């Protein structure tokens, strides 16, 4: 409908609505009042402070700013003192080191203790950069606020907004850096069509160059890759989305896909036509945070995938899902059944001692020589990938993540067929198999 | 029963019987008469001449010896003149270049034209060494004649006597060299326990050393590996037989195994228990000599084996058989059925042009990105190894040997199950699967 018109139409999917902006204003002012009354020195940072926050993602970030001469725990203990005092309700969250998260007049707030540093060149971790992030952006982003929200909204609609591990996409800081660097959403999208996995965007130098990996240089700290948590595949997906958008722009790119919602019968028929084995490992979800859980699910699912490959079941793809009480590791394999008999490798013919040992063992079939080396027919203890994974998960739970593996130790189930389709996994299955509408 | 006693008992399985020795004497004398009457200059060479020939393998080798100054075809045309004159019946065989084979008083004879060379250092091919082979052995082998027959008999009972391609075992000349080098059958057997695939036996130097491959240096020509046609696997099998013999000597090692002669029902059950796909390619045997046929069958069977591996049917082993009118290429595979769906590799995400092409094609399922690269689900045109090989043999017969492939072009059949067990292949199947007694 013309790019420029679509972008105007997208601004309403993306700009927070009426009651939301004033909900923030009312929380912010009340928070100021409570802080001011305590004589606390602070700064509101992040996307609230710069009016760059996406529709529906209202959260206030406050950094408490304490004089340089308070020790490491003097900032930690005194910092947590104020968060409790100033929030209606609160939890003690753990990013890299302890901070406070809580609520004020219905609005999410994070309070973080950090040093009040005159100029950077003084950085222990992420926390101490953050005031400088805001400082750097404040007023380079003025005027371009809706460009940021357009980019956030594009990425969110497409499942790649956020650097948390469940997503491995783009952070807010990265989105604002990009807008500063290219000037607009549209220009970011046009130029990202030519990004590669070796693209280095150096914001402070106004430069793009090649490096070893995708790297967005923090203007506040040259060693920091702002895009560190962006996965290779989400970068790929973004580059492709940018190419598709420019070739045929649409409002559709700013609206989340309403999921496939398929009936078990249609999935049964798809699985039939593909001729694969589709199954899942079901187990209880351990009570750990997403940033801990999802890396473990990834590892568990990889280790099982690798086991399936090794055992010649020819896995096609895998996926995983956490509901509220259970986790599922989903697999599709090209081999439903393998022969009972296999070939075991023995020694070179020259090696008399080891040959004697190899031939000592009783077997149903006679070993043989092939290309200078002994081989034996021996018998598998499983012939389906489901039986293999029951064995593997029973015996090798210790490699499947600390908490995921411990859970699988207490209880797991392999589910196939119509029973699999009763579990809340049908969407993940459809995506794994590339099912169309 | 004591080695020394077993060896005495083996001498009767190995020394030609009464009517055979005199059958040879009568043929030899008659052959001399016919040659002498023509004024031909000749020498009886080979195992008849040295009384080293195995029981049942009576054949007379004559070399016609012509003065140095006759051109290449002067020896070829004049040489074939005498073979026709002197044999009762004859064929014109083709070794490296044309010679005569025929019969005299019931006995096989080969007549070969060669130069009468005073001292070697004058060699164009194999033919011109041969008089020198006999010369070298004549009287180094005197006294050790039965040692040779013991070794030939050992190898024959175990299917590895003869350098023709059907066998890829030990030639007669190689057996006599070995006996000269070690002094006896028993010592040959004791020392061969330590042969490796890098063992070089240098007969004329009285030396054993390491080289790049198993090499037995012709005492008559240092460049010639007398063991050139011995396969790696037959060398392995011989080394192992030598170790087994010395550990528990028996007359059994000089008697051919009477074959397994199994009933189809037992084979059906074995195949069931292994859980494999067992099948054969059947086609008409081309009318070519064994030394041409067997290398082609080997190549055909390898190419099909390699196709099966490539297509993920996980072949275990293969074998082949020629009867009088048909050939069979036998296969056993671990996968009886593979899924219809597979993964096709596409381009890296960066490569816009090629990605557009990859995604242009209509497919039932959506392509996806994994590890920086596009992939598509696509559909196999076959899901069993039998269907695969029907396709492969129909389309790629041109790589399956000149004559074997041409035959398969005119007609082939894939046979599985109870029908397979009707063909004269049950022995080869039993051996391929390592079936016991
Ligand atoms: N571990 C952490 N603890 C405290 N602050 C962090 C931490 N990690 C990053 N930060 C900084 O805090 C600031 C706000 O972070 P946040 O992820 O909330 O970004 P945002 O710009 O406010 O975007 P969003 O709209 O998604 O909330 C950023 O400058 C960021 O660098
Ligand atoms: N490279 C491979 N080749 C052949 N077998 C392998 C290979 N890697 C692993 N295995 C076999 O698979 C088993 C399990 O491997 P895996 O890494 O999934 O589990 P693990 O618990 O991490 O390993 P482990 O039990 O050896 O400590 C190993 O114990 C080994 O016998
Ligand atoms: N292509 C050939 N044409 C003619 N002579 C050959 C050819 N190849 C090898 N020879 C030689 O002819 C001689 C006899 O060969 P042959 O294979 O018959 O051996 P043998 O000692 O007589 O054993 P056997 O008892 O198995 O017949 C050997 O010295 C051998 O080197
Ligand atoms: N290395 C491999 N990796 C993937 N595909 C292969 C490979 N080798 C062969 N192929 C595929 O298998 C087909 C047949 O291979 P094969 O060598 O058995 O028959 P060919 O008649 O000798 O080959 P061609 O038809 O290519 O001349 C090839 O045409 C090719 O598409
Ligand atoms: Cl960052
Ligand atoms: Cl030779
Ligand atoms: Mg926040
Ligand atoms: Mg928060
Ligand atoms: Mg002969
Ligand atoms: Mg002959
Ligand atoms: Mn924020
Ligand atoms: Mn383990
Ligand atoms: Mn001979
Ligand atoms: Mn071909
Ligand atoms: Na197990
Ligand atoms: Na074909």
UniProtKB/Swiss-Prot annotation, chains A, B:
Q: Which InterPro entries match?
A: CAA_C, CCA-adding_arc, CCA_tRNA_nucleotrans_2, NT_2-5OAS_ClassI-CCAase, NT_sf, NuclTrfase_I-like_C, Polymerase_NTP_transf_dom, tRNA_NucTransf2
Q: Which HAMAP family match?
A: CCA_arch
Q: What is its EC number?
A: 2.7.7.72
What cofactors does this protein use?
Mg(2+)
Superkingdom of this entry's organism?
Archaea
Q: Which family does it belong to?
A: Belongs to the tRNA nucleotidyltransferase/poly(A) polymerase family. Archaeal CCA-adding enzyme subfamily.
> What does it catalyze?
a tRNA precursor + 2 CTP + ATP = a tRNA with a 3' CCA end + 3 diphosphate; a tRNA with a 3' CCA end + 2 CTP + ATP = a tRNA with a 3' CCACCA end + 3 diphosphate
Q: Enzyme class, one word?
A: transferase
DNA-binding as a keyword?
Answer: no
Against Pfam families, the record matches this protein to:
CAA_C (PF21133), NTP_transf_2 (PF01909), tRNA_NucTransf2 (PF09249)
> What is the name listed in the Swiss-Prot or TrEMBL entry for this protein?
CCA-adding enzyme
Enumerate the residues binding CTP.
Answer: 47, 50, 133, 152, 161
Molecular-function GO terms, alphabetical = ATP binding; CCA tRNA nucleotidyltransferase activity; CCACCA tRNA nucleotidyltransferase activity; magnesium ion binding; tRNA binding
- Cite the effect that the entry attributes to residue 50 to A: High decrease in both AMP and CMP incorporation
> What is an annotated GO biological process for this record, any one?
tRNA surveillance
Going by the UniProt record, its keywords in alphabetical order are: ATP-binding, Magnesium, Metal-binding, Nucleotide-binding, Nucleotidyltransferase, RNA repair, RNA-binding, Transferase, tRNA processing
**What quaternary structure, including any partners, is listed in this protein's UniProt entry?**
Homodimer.
Instruction: Name the gene behind this protein.
Output: cca
Q: Report the function annotation for this chain.
A: Catalyzes the addition and repair of the essential 3'-terminal CCA sequence in tRNAs without using a nucleic acid template. Adds these three nucleotides in the order of C, C, and A to the tRNA nucleotide-73, using CTP and ATP as substrates and producing inorganic pyrophosphate. tRNA 3'-terminal CCA addition is required both for tRNA processing and repair. Also involved in tRNA surveillance by mediating tandem CCA addition to generate a CCACCA at the 3' terminus of unstable tRNAs. While stable tRNAs receive only 3'-terminal CCA, unstable tRNAs are marked with CCACCA and rapidly degraded.
Additional information: A single active site specifically recognizes both ATP and CTP and is responsible for their addition. In contrast to the eubacterial homologs, the specificity of the nucleotide-binding pocket is determined by both the enzyme and the tRNA.
| Amino-acid positions noted as binding Mg(2+) in the UniProt annotation, renumbered to this chain | 59, 61, 110
Amino acids binding ATP? 47, 50, 133, 152, 161
